[PDB]
Design a protein around this ligand. Structure first.
Ligand SMILES: Cc1csc(NC(=O)CN2C(=O)CCc3ccccc32)c1-c1ncn[nH]1
Lengths: 10, 340
């Protein structure tokens, strides 16, 4: 139930 | 209250003073869109200037629908309208309409090309589905989902832009591209095109005419069942029935373990499974929004607040239906375009 908090749009 | 001008190509954007540093992030037929700083929220927003809102009756009906549709929806996975304004101060000189929306970092075109672990993949797809389901509950079937109108933030949140609808063909459902009718799970087809492409890093069904688009469908998914092909108008059928007869490549072959984070097997078979159910030519055999959300690959993320959230209004099936004069469309839109 702990979702990602980051997404590498870099 | 007070306005200023910024050029922006051949277009002039006259906007409330609180919106600053305008630069073009996209254009087309809907209208031109700039990113902008909102001084009053200290946040970046997107300003869309509607393309000739009152050129004719379809332009006008399309602008009022944009607005009445927007104010049927309120969800964390749907881009919300923040403000709308007009620089004109009276009904008879009114022409320009600006929509101000939430801004994100990027569309999914970036993300499809990278390489995601299961929680990000699964979590993006879960948010896509909560947004789609909220559209459907409001009476909105989108029909035009694809990577370019699904937008994302570097914190891994995601929103769906317009609805649908509104070159774009690759993601369109078979019932659409063969002129059958459609219901809710037409958007399910498109989620499988996005998801399948997220795993494979290329467009599932290319071409360049619908003709060639159908080819890549059958080449990969096999020819549909004979009963499905009766439902098709005599004309579409004759064509479809007389193409080469493929068995289909199957989902392990289309999407093997080699393509996924791995054990993690599990796990890839969960993703494979969902795709085997989403990418089903026949809408009557295809997974619905609900079952896709109840599916083991997505259902990890389940929150009652995000899934069961009812819309502020279910969209008026019709009026849809209903014509006005361009003077009477003006009145309805001006009414909104300063509606407090
Ligand atoms: C209306 C609207 C509301 S949010 C949004 N865009 C995004 O959220 C993501 N986004 C894009 O996708 C195009 C490239 C881009 C550059 C700078 C900032 C954002 C974006 C838009 C939009 N982007 C492109 N056309 N319209």
């Amino acid at each position: 139930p702990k979702r990602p908090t980051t997404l590498n749009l870099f | 209250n007070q306005f200023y001008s910024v050029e922006v190509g051949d277009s002039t954007f006259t906007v409330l003073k609180r919106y600053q540093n305008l630069k073009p992030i996209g254009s087309g037929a809907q209208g031109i869109v700039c990113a902008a700083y909102d001084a009053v929220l200290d946040r970046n927003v997107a300003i869309k200037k509607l393309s000739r809102p009152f050129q004719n009756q379809t332009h006008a009906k399309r602008a009022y629908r944009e607005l009445v549709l927007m104010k049927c929806v309120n969800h964390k996975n749907i881009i919300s309208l923040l403000n709308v304004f007009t620089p004109q101060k009276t009904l008879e000189e009114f022409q320009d309409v600006y929509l101000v929306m939430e801004l994100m970092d990027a569309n999914l075109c970036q993300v499809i090309q990278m390489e995601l672990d299961h929680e990000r993949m699964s979590y993006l797809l879960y948010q896509m589905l909560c947004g789609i389901k909220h559209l459907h509950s409001a009476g909105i079937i989108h029909r035009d989902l694809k990577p370019s109108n699904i937008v994302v933030k570097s914190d891994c949140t995601l929103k769906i832009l317009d609805f649908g609808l509104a070159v774009t063909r690759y993601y369109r459902a078979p019932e659409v591209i063969l002129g059958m009718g459609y219901k809710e799970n037409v958007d399910i087809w498109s989620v499988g095109c996005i998801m399948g492409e997220m795993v494979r890093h290329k467009i599932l069904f290319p071409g360049r005419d619908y003709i060639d688009q159908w080819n890549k469908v059958i080449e990969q998914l096999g020819t549909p069942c004979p009963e499905f092909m009766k439902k098709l108008q005599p004309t579409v059928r004759n064509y479809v029935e007389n193409r080469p007869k493929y068995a289909g490549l199957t989902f392990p072959k289309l999407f093997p373990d080699s393509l996924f984070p791995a054990h993690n097997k599990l796990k890839a078979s969960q993703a494979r499974d969902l795709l085997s159910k989403m990418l089903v030519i026949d809408p009557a055999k295809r997974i619905s929004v609900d079952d896709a959300l109840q599916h083991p690959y997505i259902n990890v993320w389940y929150d009652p607040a995000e899934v069961e959230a009812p819309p502020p209004q279910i969209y008026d099936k019709q009026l849809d239906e209903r014509e006005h004069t361009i003077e009477e469309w003006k009145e309805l839109i001006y009414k909104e375009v300063m509606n407090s």
